[PDB]
Protein backbone atom coordinates (compact mmCIF):
# COMPACT_ATOMS: atom_id res chain seq x y z
CA UNK A 1 0.00 0.00 0.00
CA UNK A 2 1.03 3.62 -0.40
CA UNK A 3 -0.22 7.10 0.34
CA UNK A 4 -2.11 9.11 -2.29
CA UNK A 5 -3.95 5.82 -3.01
CA UNK A 6 -4.71 4.70 0.55
CA UNK A 7 -8.16 3.57 -0.61
CA UNK A 8 -6.42 0.62 -2.32
CA UNK A 9 -4.65 -2.47 -0.99
CA UNK A 10 -2.60 -4.65 -3.33
CA UNK A 11 -2.41 -8.43 -2.90
CA UNK A 12 -0.08 -9.96 -5.51
CA UNK A 13 -0.95 -6.92 -7.60
CA UNK A 14 -4.69 -7.48 -7.08
CA UNK A 15 -6.00 -4.08 -6.00
CA UNK A 16 -8.72 -4.26 -3.35
CA UNK A 17 -10.98 -1.45 -2.16
CA UNK A 18 -11.75 -0.12 1.31
CA UNK A 19 -15.47 0.16 2.20
CA UNK A 20 -14.59 3.48 3.88
CA UNK A 21 -12.56 6.64 3.24
CA UNK A 22 -9.68 8.03 5.30
CA UNK A 23 -7.27 10.93 5.03
CA UNK A 24 -5.64 10.86 8.47
CA UNK A 25 -6.45 7.47 10.03
CA UNK A 26 -3.43 6.17 8.08
CA UNK A 27 -1.13 9.21 8.18
CA UNK A 28 -0.03 8.21 11.71
CA UNK A 29 2.28 5.21 11.38
CA UNK A 30 4.74 6.33 14.07
CA UNK A 31 3.79 3.22 16.09
CA UNK A 32 3.38 0.60 13.34
CA UNK A 33 7.13 0.11 12.81
CA UNK A 34 8.33 -1.09 16.24
CA UNK A 35 6.60 -2.23 19.42
CA UNK A 36 7.68 0.08 22.24
CA UNK A 37 9.19 2.91 20.20
CA UNK A 38 8.11 5.91 18.16
CA UNK A 39 9.63 7.63 15.15
CA UNK A 40 11.34 10.98 15.67
CA UNK A 41 13.25 13.58 13.69
CA UNK A 42 16.25 12.33 11.74
CA UNK A 43 19.62 12.53 13.47
CA UNK A 44 22.80 11.01 11.98
CA UNK A 45 24.71 11.23 15.27
CA UNK A 46 22.48 8.54 16.74
CA UNK A 47 24.13 5.11 16.41
CA UNK A 48 22.86 2.32 14.22
CA UNK A 49 21.53 -0.72 16.07
CA UNK A 50 19.67 -3.99 15.50
CA UNK A 51 16.33 -5.37 16.65
CA UNK A 52 17.87 -7.35 19.54
CA UNK A 53 19.86 -4.76 21.50
CA UNK A 54 16.67 -2.65 21.60
CA UNK A 55 15.84 -4.36 24.90
CA UNK A 56 18.78 -2.67 26.67
CA UNK A 57 17.92 0.90 25.62
CA UNK A 58 16.69 3.65 27.92
CA UNK A 59 14.59 6.79 27.51
CA UNK A 60 15.50 10.02 25.78
CA UNK A 61 18.02 7.93 23.82
Amino acid sequence: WSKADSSKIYCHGIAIRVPLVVGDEHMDTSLALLEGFSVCENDPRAPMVTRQDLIDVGFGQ
Partner: protein, 62 residues
Protein backbone atom coordinates in the same frame (compact mmCIF):
# COMPACT_ATOMS: atom_id res chain seq x y z
CA UNK B 1 44.30 18.55 33.94
CA UNK B 2 45.92 16.01 31.60
CA UNK B 3 42.66 14.40 30.56
CA UNK B 4 40.13 14.75 27.75
CA UNK B 5 37.34 12.44 28.93
CA UNK B 6 34.00 13.71 30.18
CA UNK B 7 32.55 13.53 33.68
CA UNK B 8 30.77 10.25 32.86
CA UNK B 9 33.71 8.02 31.95
CA UNK B 10 35.82 9.83 34.53
CA UNK B 11 33.20 9.09 37.20
CA UNK B 12 33.14 5.43 36.17
CA UNK B 13 36.93 5.23 36.35
CA UNK B 14 37.06 6.94 39.75
CA UNK B 15 34.36 4.62 41.06
CA UNK B 16 36.38 1.61 39.94
CA UNK B 17 39.48 3.12 41.55
CA UNK B 18 37.69 3.66 44.86
CA UNK B 19 36.27 0.13 44.68
CA UNK B 20 39.79 -1.23 44.16
CA UNK B 21 41.30 0.78 47.03
CA UNK B 22 39.08 -1.39 49.25
CA UNK B 23 41.26 -4.34 48.17
CA UNK B 24 43.62 -3.80 51.11
CA UNK B 25 43.91 -5.57 54.44
CA UNK B 26 41.60 -5.49 57.42
CA UNK B 27 38.03 -6.56 58.01
CA UNK B 28 35.23 -4.78 56.13
CA UNK B 29 37.37 -5.33 53.02
CA UNK B 30 36.63 -7.82 50.25
CA UNK B 31 39.53 -10.25 50.96
CA UNK B 32 38.50 -10.99 54.55
CA UNK B 33 34.87 -11.36 53.46
CA UNK B 34 35.84 -13.79 50.70
CA UNK B 35 37.88 -15.79 53.21
CA UNK B 36 34.80 -15.85 55.44
CA UNK B 37 32.60 -16.49 52.36
CA UNK B 38 30.40 -13.52 53.32
CA UNK B 39 29.34 -12.87 49.74
CA UNK B 40 26.40 -10.83 51.09
CA UNK B 41 28.26 -8.01 52.86
CA UNK B 42 29.73 -7.06 49.47
CA UNK B 43 26.31 -5.99 48.19
CA UNK B 44 26.09 -3.49 51.06
CA UNK B 45 29.42 -1.76 50.43
CA UNK B 46 29.33 2.05 50.15
CA UNK B 47 31.26 2.14 46.88
CA UNK B 48 28.64 0.19 44.95
CA UNK B 49 26.16 2.58 46.55
CA UNK B 50 28.06 5.50 44.99
CA UNK B 51 28.34 3.87 41.56
CA UNK B 52 24.70 2.76 41.46
CA UNK B 53 23.34 6.06 40.02
CA UNK B 54 25.44 5.34 36.93
CA UNK B 55 23.62 2.06 36.25
CA UNK B 56 20.97 1.88 33.57
CA UNK B 57 17.84 2.33 35.73
CA UNK B 58 15.35 0.37 33.59
CA UNK B 59 17.27 -2.93 33.86
CA UNK B 60 19.25 -2.56 37.09
CA UNK B 61 17.43 -5.40 38.83
CA UNK B 62 18.00 -8.05 36.18
Amino acid sequence: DLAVLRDEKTAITKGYEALIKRLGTGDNDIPSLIAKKDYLSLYNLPEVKLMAPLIRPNRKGV
